[PDB]
Design a protein around this nucleic acid. Structure first.
Length: 47
RNA sequence: UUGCACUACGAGUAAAGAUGCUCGUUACGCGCGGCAGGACGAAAAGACCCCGGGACCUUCACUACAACUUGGUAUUGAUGU
């Protein structure tokens, strides 16, 4: 699943390349950091 | 407690231990005080024995489950050799 970063991280990468999260490592780590989104209407606001 | 009733004894007979059957013997009728041999005395659908049901108990019986433990996957992530 691709998603929409805010800061460059050694797993996720840039903002908008190809996201390969580990299934929980996002909402327990990333989404508290305010650096990642579970994509709902984000594949075009990313643009 | 109670099927009766005017409820003898013997030797027998009978479900094998007779107040009631048989053959005899012995007893006027009723009553009150005693004993307690019998009435398979009363009580208590024998406690024992055996059959049938149940009960609880045990366990190198049966099958379950609890509980204790084993891993599998979800919550469970990163970076690294």
């Amino acid at each position: 699943m691709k998603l929409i970063l805010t800061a460059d991280v050694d797993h996720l990468g840039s903002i908008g390349d190809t996201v390969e999260v580990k299934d929980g490592y996002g909402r327990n780590f990333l989404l508290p950091r305010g650096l990642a989104i579970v994509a709902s209407r984000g594949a075009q606001k990313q643009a």
